[PDB]
Design a protein around this ligand. Structure first.
Ligand SMILES: Cc1cc2nc3c(=O)[nH]c(=O)nc-3n(C[C@H](O)[C@H](O)[C@H](O)COP(=O)(O)OP(=O)(O)OC[C@H]3O[C@@H](n4cnc5c(N)ncnc54)[C@H](O)[C@@H]3O)c2cc1C
Ligand SMILES: Cc1cc2nc3c(=O)[nH]c(=O)nc-3n(C[C@H](O)[C@H](O)[C@H](O)COP(=O)(O)OP(=O)(O)OC[C@H]3O[C@@H](n4cnc5c(N)ncnc54)[C@H](O)[C@@H]3O)c2cc1C
Ligand SMILES: CSc1ccccc1
Ligand SMILES: CSc1ccccc1
Lengths: 411, 411
């Protein structure tokens, strides 16, 4: 009945609040104050689809639902190789239920406040092995929910579940005000630049109100691997507009008057997709369980990290509650992760790792057919809510043709 | 806001009650009265695992939860080829949360009563095309939830999702009183007779109170394809005991004083696993959507039909509620099924169709290893709650060896 969590992030706080509500005692380690998180740099574009949002609703944690703009569809565009400034693919499809992007700068600090108000023990320290050794002696279970923090490397990389050992994209974020709203409905507007990268943009809620978030992913060494020489916010905004002018002029028409939401509404970085073994053993022989990005870390190209974090914390909470007074031993830890991985995250991860690679012919045919077969576009869009629904037709050519036929027959 | 359902069974009634609670008008066609169902022959062994049970809880429909015996684990035994009357494999593992088997003779008629009390329109008739033509003119959506009824063949068989066109097992059920309870916990006791068939037994609740349900599955033409000459209840009970004496004498020790719960607590039959296309078009050109066993029908060897029905009706209810005033057209119908199939039922179906075939070597090694690696036994047992968690390690030899290693490392 006493649980410790290292890392006051999305999964750690969602889990901790769920545990307090179920009557557990929870100790949490945070390496930052709430206000420094609110005013520091953005961490994500955190587009959460309806199933993830519902996990939050069900815990009573959808505190921004009324004020956050809804994201109501997915759009996909590809530049026309010949015609200047035109697209050869340009379609959209509605989500069956809205997505929402609530800035983690808002959400994480407010959930830290709620955690304390609900009786959690917040401890402020950059935690290391010594804190984990202490926690495992005074608590029935200790989780590491540290995201991309260095302590996450305590867990052993799972080579067989990690096909990549290098970053597959160069990343940047720019949060802006003044973008022309998308009509007639909002969407994740996905621009796929063949051989170069991707630009995604959608509305969100941040610390100065509603905005849109521009998301840039560049094939390393290509024209959109282009943030190294950017050293000021102003240079960042300018490089952002430069990308749209150069590769997606249709989107640049929406951005004639964009400004940064704030000077810290920017980010640039990269990382390798990595899966890790969930059970780490400390020097003392005691054991800790990794959560969410500590054990399954994906490139953001499919917008699944925050969705994975919510779904992972839900699965771990259910497993803790079902265990009761049972021992939180390594077997239980491993089985808890196994259910998440084999039941769900392996399919999110396989799909995302496929999309980082160059698209094979059957995939380009799927993307093209979706522009003329609205049921297939709808399947694409709503697959973002449960990427299991892409298999096997997205990854295999013969099955892709069968599914196109199924969709065509009901259009 | 007006919905018609043909077939007053598990999925149709669960869906109908969910719809009434959400404010819809629901018309339902039943081909039997509630009392004739309560007193007629058994229809299933309906072992529902925790996720399915929770769908019922969440709708307020767990009316027997306190009185039904819990099923708390899974056991697996294989006879020893040499040693007489002994087993070469004999292990068990606890379920993380209980399963329960509430006889459909109890559940379906009580839910019919509740359906009427909550304002549903129950119509008593053996429905055919004429009723479907009428319903599609007076309702916004018409579903066919007819199980193995003849009208289910209105929907087109999906050859590519149906590897079998003949029954793979000869089936029988015997509901009994007086069986020695399993100690120290209850379980689905699975007896795998190599090359012959399977005997499963577990506690349940029926119309005369708590019982156990014996489940017999025989490879066609083999020693357990043995119900053709049985023509009375007494002969049925006797043939049931004969099987245990001949192939599972360890189970016969529990059955020295068993009696039928009632003369209609017996069943024998067979059918081919079949998947169908979800959208059927009537002579008028109007369309209907199939539900649960109408579109995905599996052999009962994995105990998944009632679980699939609950999960299918949950997915369809969520899809209806999300649609709102949107058209219930063929595309929406097809996408609703697609989410069920690609997201979930394809994996239940692939797993079950593999187990009907002879077990390959890596599978026999998995079953053997589970007796000495408790984390692998636990994975087997709790996989019954979400068969997605068997992939890819159950179906591929190299991945099975990797998972055995993972389980061994935390034992
Ligand atoms: C550029 C980018 C774009 C993204 N876009 C999306 C999107 O559109 N949709 C989506 O679903 N996901 C998106 N994500 C992913 C998502 O933001 C993360 O996957 C999610 O935050 C993971 O939650 P978590 O709990 O695992 O980690 P985090 O939310 O990162 O929480 C980890 C916390 O632990 C802290 N910590 C680290 N080390 C220690 C320590 N020693 N002691 C104490 N605390 C420590 C960290 O500082 C942090 O506060 C994006 C990510 C990036 C980088
Ligand atoms: C031997 C056996 C053992 C089983 N064991 C298990 C187990 O342990 N666990 C498990 O999870 N599942 C088990 N099942 C499967 C499970 O019982 C079914 O999959 C489940 O009942 C399917 O629900 P449904 O709504 O699709 O169909 P049903 O529950 O069968 O409902 C269909 C209804 O429609 C009626 N109907 C048919 N035609 C018409 C018509 N023209 N008009 C009106 N009504 C009509 C039928 O009479 C019936 O009442 C077993 C099945 C069998 C046969
Ligand atoms: C930031 S990349 C992405 C893709 C899809 C949905 C949301 C975000
Ligand atoms: C009736 S076969 C079976 C198998 C597993 C669980 C329940 C039933």
């Amino acid at each position: 009945k006493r649980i410790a969590i290292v890392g006051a992030g999305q999964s750690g706080l969602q889990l901790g609040l769920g545990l307090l509500a179920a009557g557990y005692e929870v100790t949490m380690f945070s390496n930052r104050t709430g206000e420094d998180i609110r005013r520091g740099k953005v961490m994500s574009s955190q587009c959460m689809f309806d199933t993830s949002l519902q996990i939050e609703r069900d815990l009573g944690l959808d505190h921004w639902a009324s004020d956050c703009p809804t994201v109501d569809g997915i759009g996909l565009a590809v530049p026309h190789p010949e015609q200047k400034g035109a697209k050869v693919i340009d379609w959209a499809a509605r989500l069956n239920a809205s997505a929402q992007s609530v800035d983690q700068r808002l959400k994480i600090p407010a959930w830290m406040d709620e955690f304390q108000k609900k009786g959690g023990e917040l401890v402020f320290k950059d935690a290391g092995i010594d804190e984990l050794e202490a926690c495992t002696q005074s608590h029935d279970l200790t989780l590491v929910a540290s995201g991309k923090g260095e302590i996450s490397k305590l867990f052993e990389r799972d080579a067989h579940k990690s096909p990549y050992d290098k970053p597959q994209r160069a990343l940047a974020l720019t949060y802006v005000k003044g973008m022309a709203p998308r009509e007639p409905f909002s969407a994740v507007c996905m621009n796929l630049i063949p051989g170069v990268g991707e630009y995604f943009v959608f509305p969100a809620l941040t610390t100065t109100g509603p905005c849109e978030i521009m998301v840039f992913e560049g094939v390393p060494g290509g024209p959109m691997d282009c943030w190294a020489d950017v050293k000021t916010p102003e240079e960042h905004l300018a490089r952002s507009k430069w990308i749209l002018d150069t590769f997606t002029p249709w989107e640049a028409e929406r951005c004639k008057d964009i400004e940064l939401t704030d000077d810290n509404g920017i980010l640039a970085g990269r990382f390798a997709p990595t899966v890790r073994k969930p059970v780490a053993t400390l020097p003392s022989g005691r054991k800790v369980l990794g959560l969410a990005d500590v054990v399954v870390l994906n490139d953001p190209i499919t917008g699944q990290g925050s969705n994975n974090a919510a779904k992972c914390a839900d699965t771990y909470l259910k497993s803790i509650l079902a265990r009761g007074d049972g021992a939180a031993d390594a077997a239980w830890m491993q089985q808890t992760f196994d259910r998440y991985w084999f039941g769900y995250a392996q399919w999110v991860t396989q799909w995302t790792n496929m999309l980082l690679a160059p698209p094979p012919p059957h995939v380009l045919n799927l993307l093209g057919s979706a522009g003329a077969v609205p049921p297939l576009a709808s399947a694409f869009a709503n697959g973002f809510d449960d990427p299991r629904t892409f298999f096997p037709w997205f990854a295999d050519a013969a099955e892709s043709e069968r599914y196109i036929a199924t969709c065509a027959a009901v259009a």
